[PDB]
Amino acid sequence: SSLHPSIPCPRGHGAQKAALVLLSACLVTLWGLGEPPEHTLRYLVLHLASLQLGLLLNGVCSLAEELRHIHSRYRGSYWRTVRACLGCPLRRGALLLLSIYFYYSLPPFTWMLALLGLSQALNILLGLKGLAPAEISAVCEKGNFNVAHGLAWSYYIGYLRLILPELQARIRTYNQHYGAVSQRLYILLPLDCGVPDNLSMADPNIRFLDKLPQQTGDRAGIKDRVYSNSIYELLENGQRAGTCVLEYATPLQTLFAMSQYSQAGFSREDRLEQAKLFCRTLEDILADAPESQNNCRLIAYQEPSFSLSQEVLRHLRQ
Amino acid sequence: SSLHPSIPCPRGHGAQKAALVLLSACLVTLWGLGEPPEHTLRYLVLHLASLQLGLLLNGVCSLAEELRHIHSRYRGSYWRTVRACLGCPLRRGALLLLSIYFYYSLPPFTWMLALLGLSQALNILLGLKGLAPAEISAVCEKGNFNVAHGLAWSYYIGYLRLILPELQARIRTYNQHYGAVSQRLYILLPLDCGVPDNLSMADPNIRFLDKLPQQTGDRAGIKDRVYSNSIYELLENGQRAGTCVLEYATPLQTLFAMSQYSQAGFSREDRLEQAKLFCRTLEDILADAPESQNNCRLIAYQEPSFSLSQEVLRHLRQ
């Protein structure tokens, strides 16, 4: 990571390595105990069969609910619903038949089935199937089930992809028709999502200069939609030090407000996590984005004293 | 849902009813088999103990990974990381002690622990911890782990919350200076996420008439950010039939773009699901929003034959 140390890096395969260590330790233990190795395989297969049967029971329980959404979620198809509730039906059926064959045959199946169903019903009714926070976060980042992902892609697709290509032209026009504004757009990324509408209320040194010429385009059925970029003066010890096109990242305002509305179901820990995820995703997008031909810089900072103007000037004087 | 029948309703408790029926059936089956309830209780407790030990081992394996993000994601606290990997540690410890006690007491513990660890390691290494699509969708909707949620809240907070209060004044100003446009902002919600940049290209009857009295204000370091809302005339049979403010929902354009980009990890089925989720979320927000004092009207439509102008005129007349 390079934006800010607080930004987490993508998760690796540490869990699989721990699993391999656990497997080795368990095999060594079973070897030490000196137990009939055929029993080990027998009972492991029985345990996996129990897991498969429990998955089947929970899947039918969830199907009881998902069938009410068949015509809206699954195109009125029962096969798609069954697949959503039990994975691939062919593999699940194959493993179910293997379980049945290797339980009835290896040294009652109906009693075991009743017990597994009782356990599954107890877990479902009491809500014991809740995923751990780490598992939920891993599932969300893996499949990009996050608001920050969509916000970053909206910021790139809706604003940056349509502004950065025509940013140098407007800057050169302003320079011709008027100071030495830095030839880039600097985006502030407050991880606290404290985005004021005025940069002068954050740091007095950051003062408002003139503005770039408006950019107009037809967007989503709105004729001549306006995009305006403001130019700000950076004051050091009361004297101007540098000029640049500065602006906060607006989606952080949405992240902050969502933590203020109870209807959003968005907590403050979620706010921080999604802000950092937004920063990471935006950096990843800009890395491979062809529009960003050195036309944008991301400035992520955290408030513990702190001077925003100093960070901007550090990123400018490099 | 009144927008479109294709919008799926929120999930209920069908899984709970199915679990209750399964519980009753399993109790009946155990009664029929004639075995005494004491053995059933013993083996049920043993199965739950095995589940608890498996959870412990999986949490240890996942902690082996989450400890790498202790400082960035967990604020340098080992308690928080362990909690994320094992839920509330106190409850987990209590249940583990219960499991150990009711194993050593109920007719070798270490061997079963090794077997369970072997099974968990096999599940982790072979990627058998996968959660079914229905489970993942339910976990996301309950926790609002979706891009559509953030996009809808950004659209409401970013644009509607600032435009709807001042829309009546702008429309009245436009009328006094010329115009019998309607007193609502009509929003198009294509479930296919088409969103062309010009309405007339989707339906020739939709023809641009004139703009509105531009609204401007400060927004996240941008001075005089301009908000534009255009007016379109609704042609019908070659002559005018209605006029109002009409514009697409840009977050759907963002969703469509995300499906085109591979860096987003966003599919087209996910695109449709997230578009419908966005529509439902925006519907739910405007219902309880103080700003939507009858000042907006959401229009959702799936392209089969059909005419956008006809849909808008139907929503106007009706």
Add this chain to the structure above:
Amino acid sequence: SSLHPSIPCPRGHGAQKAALVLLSACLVTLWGLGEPPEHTLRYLVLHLASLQLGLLLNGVCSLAEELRHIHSRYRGSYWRTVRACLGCPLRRGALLLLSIYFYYSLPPFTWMLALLGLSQALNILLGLKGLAPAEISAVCEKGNFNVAHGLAWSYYIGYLRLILPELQARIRTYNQHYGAVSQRLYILLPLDCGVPDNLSMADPNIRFLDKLPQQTGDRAGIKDRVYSNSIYELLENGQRAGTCVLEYATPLQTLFAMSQYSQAGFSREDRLEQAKLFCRTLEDILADAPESQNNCRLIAYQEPSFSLSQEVLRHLRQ
């Protein structure tokens, strides 16, 4: 499929269904034979262990070669090379340890290892590991290891994506400055890849009318790269019937020529298969392409008599 009946449809899951049927039949057979079920599991696990060991041996054999390409293919990393030769090392190691534990323990490991290595060496030296044509084709279509995929994406990205958006404008300009040319671009897709440079040499009825105004753009460091679309007159019984912008698909010329150069290693059966795959992929691309707002039609035909002008007029008169 709709382009042409000869175009294959994507492969389904028939192999998995046949596998499930085979599994059921084998389980029924084993049950009928009345054999100790523990032996079945024992020998199945032994067979899978043998397969894992054979995979390990073949993987090290292939690593012996892939290590020579470590600095060019795998970024000078040995871990990446090992992963490319043996899949995920963690899972492979786990299954190897399971094999070792459940072979030495279930009723010589070194003799079996030597025999498996001998078999693997015999297969490698004699070239017995060759994949069947169906398996190769499935692997290629699954991962898009095909020339036709790249050719279709080049045709869309390089030509259509930069022509179709500005096609109606040029057609309207020609109509103003001059007949009733159809308002679309019609692309011929001869599955035999017999693409002549002159449409009049194929069918005399297809005659050359004037041409659309040139389209110019800077492409790949070439200033004002020219794109020219020709207009052709469709003669029926000696009299004009319709006008349209017609052109063959050029990548078919490359497909044909590649079958003429031995240096290409491209056969005629490969030519036909890749031509049909190109047609399918182009249709799939245009289906979801936003540029194709009814601006292009694909005309795939096969020569058994046949009149190209008749097919063009059939697609025009619809």
Add this chain to the structure above:
Amino acid sequence: SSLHPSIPCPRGHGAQKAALVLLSACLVTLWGLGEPPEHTLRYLVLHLASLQLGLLLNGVCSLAEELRHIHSRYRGSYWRTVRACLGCPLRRGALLLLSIYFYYSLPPFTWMLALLGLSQALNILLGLKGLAPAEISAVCEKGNFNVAHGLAWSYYIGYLRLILPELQARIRTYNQHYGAVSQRLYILLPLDCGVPDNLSMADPNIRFLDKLPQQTGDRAGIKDRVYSNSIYELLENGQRAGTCVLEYATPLQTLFAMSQYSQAGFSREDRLEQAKLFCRTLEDILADAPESQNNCRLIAYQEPSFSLSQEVLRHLRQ
């Protein structure tokens, strides 16, 4: 490879040498264990028979799917489909008869057949037939199942084969009418697939000077298709140092675009590999091409610092 060291050389026979060493080691081990060669031969033949039966069963399972494409992909011939699913049927039948004979004869066949079918069905249903990345890459390179192959052959056939013969005449015409440009077409092969639409944006020294005497001809129904090749001056230290015809390879732009689109199923590692494969294939083609009579020069470069103009001037001077 002289283009760039990062271009991997074609694979050799290292796997064969490794297999030979493994064979020798296994023979030595079997000699050491002291078992007679007769048992070794028996069990080796049994193992090969098991492999043959597994191939038979997998081919039956895959035929259950390929029979759906008998008419579209196999020309309505069952023999061709069976051959694609089982290689040459005669050899497969001979080997199966040998297996049956040497099983019934060498100290229950149907039980082992059922076990092998169970194993094959498990492998198919669980998706265990996956081929390692090295194996897939070798199969693709041997069979030229790559997009880069088709792109390179299209670039040579489509553009170079038509431009190189007439490039000298055009350059001479340009010189007589004005100019000391070089007598070769220089092609840039960025392994990162950047390919900006204007050279000066990648290096300010690369400045457009003038075009050439446009070449035109008929191409796949396009009358007077125009081929343009621009001239760029190579600045060095503020004054001219060299002039020649310079243009990027557009197939690399196609590769980059394919990686941006999700519908392509094209990754970025695959992008780099296919770019290097394209460069190698184009190098191999021009070596034996009658058209490349010293009329072209390929320049490959990976962006580390480095200057494109410096690379071009180095290739010119040297």
